[PDB]
């Protein structure tokens, strides 16, 4: 199997405009939303049909209760941060947790928090400690690091539980997540050569330009990998043409174990 990841995000907002939720949580496998909860629906619900089909109503009912508890803990935690930063107005608090199962079989795990969209606290599950970015974080770090049982619980969850959930969801969603749609690749002129790929899945792809068999990264413009809307992706890369000398340019594309070369005549 290729590399895969499972991640859960929380967002709290302290003074949201009317109608907008003070709390949202979304889970992802790779790029795919799999679950969603917010303080307006107050229900945890599937976001992918293969989650809805493989997890019984008692799963959703239970995690709905757990996310209502998270919603309240996030409100309290954000109230305390904003008081300690001495900040008025609307501020955000975010959490991200997850793991990756790499192609070679190795694993990774991560857990971190942000305040107003900037790193705040970062967990190291090998040294069993929290990195604090400022003195407000440093106060929280002290309280959390005094609870060594909870550090050990988080290490176990990242290393064993998260990877087990990920393998379970990967099997649920295998028709979607383990498929391969190769790219359709073309070269155009607009003076620069554009190497364009579309229709591919998974989104991970590597496109570059080589000039007389040499790669010059600082000369290449790299487009983003963008969703096409139908479950596949598109991307591009461009390089500027030298009007004073001929050169042999080639677009190189790697995707899911297959390499492609388009030599420009």
């Amino acid at each position, epitope marked *: 199997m290729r590399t895969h990841s499972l991640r859960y995000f929380h967002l709290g907002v302290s003074d949201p405009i009317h109608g907008v939720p003070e709390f949202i949580s979304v889970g992802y496998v790779d790029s795919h939303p799999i679950t969603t909860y917010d303080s307006v629906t107050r229900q945890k619900e599937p976001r992918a049909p293969w989650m809805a089909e493989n997890l019984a109503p008692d799963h959703w009912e239970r995690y709905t209760q757990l996310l209502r508890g998270w919603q309240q803990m996030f409100k309290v935690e954000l109230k305390r941060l904003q008081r300690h930063y001495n900040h008025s107005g609307s501020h955000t608090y975010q959490r991200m947790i997850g793991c990756e199962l790499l192609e070679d079989g190795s694993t990774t795990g991560f857990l971190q928090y942000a305040y107003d969209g900037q790193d705040f606290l970062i967990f190291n599950k090998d040294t069993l400690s929290w990195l604090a970015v400022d003195n407000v974080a440093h106060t929280i770090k002290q309280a959390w690091e005094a609870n060594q049982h909870e550090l050990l*619980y988080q290490k176990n*969850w990242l290393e*064993e539980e998260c990877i087990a959930w990920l393998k379970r969801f990967l099997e649920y969603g295998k028709d979607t997540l383990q498929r391969t749609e190769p790219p359709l690749v073309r070269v155009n002129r607009k003076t620069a050569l554009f190497c364009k790929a579309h229709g591919f899945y998974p989104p991970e792809i590597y496109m570059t330009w080589m000039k007389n068999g040499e790669e010059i990264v600082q000369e290449i413009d790299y487009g983003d990998i963008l969703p096409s809307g139908d479950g596949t992706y598109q991307a591009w890369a461009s390089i500027e043409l030298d009007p004073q000398s001929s050169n042999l340019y080639s677009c190189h594309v790697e995707h899911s174990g297959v390499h492609m070369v388009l030599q420009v005549p």
Partner: antibody
Amino acid sequence: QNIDQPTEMTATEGAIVQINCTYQTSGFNGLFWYQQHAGEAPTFLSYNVLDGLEEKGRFSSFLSRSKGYSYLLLKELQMKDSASYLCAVKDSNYQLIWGAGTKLIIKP
Amino acid sequence: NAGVTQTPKFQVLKTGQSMTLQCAQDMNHNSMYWYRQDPGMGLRLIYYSASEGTTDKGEVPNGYNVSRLNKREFSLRLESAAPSQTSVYFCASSVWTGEGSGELFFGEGSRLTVLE
């Protein structure tokens, strides 16, 4: 899913006793031991979630995740250690599964 | 600084009679629980309340209902007592539901006997 511990154990004052707890669960988020004197409320003794031994006073708690087993070790037993000992495991959905409890009887 | 206070300690009931058990905690805990304990088996959750403003069934909800009246209090209602509800009932609380390692703090227990 199930959790198993002996119904009762009897040992002599001053000695050592090991109370075993084995569990079969889908997922594992840690194992708890509680003490419950006859007619009283359970109170928290220990929590293990990685492999190994943790000491607290005369009581130690051991966990092996791969064999799905823990023990509560009581050294230098006293009469006041007479009680039931309950083990509980937190499963993949963070729900506790409780063992039926081990009644420890101490011979003076 | 009382911890978890539940009442009553003892109660005899006739089949069909109604009863409310009370439970309060002064620990500013978010999560509360009602368990029954019977001989030969582990504690069984009846209903729980992960946070103020929400409740849900446990493993043995039938014949019971609960009210999370506020952050402190979580009552257990037996609308029409059955002899199978003879048991010892424990209320418990924890700081919240997300603390993986968080322990339960128990009340002193309520012994109920239901007789025809």
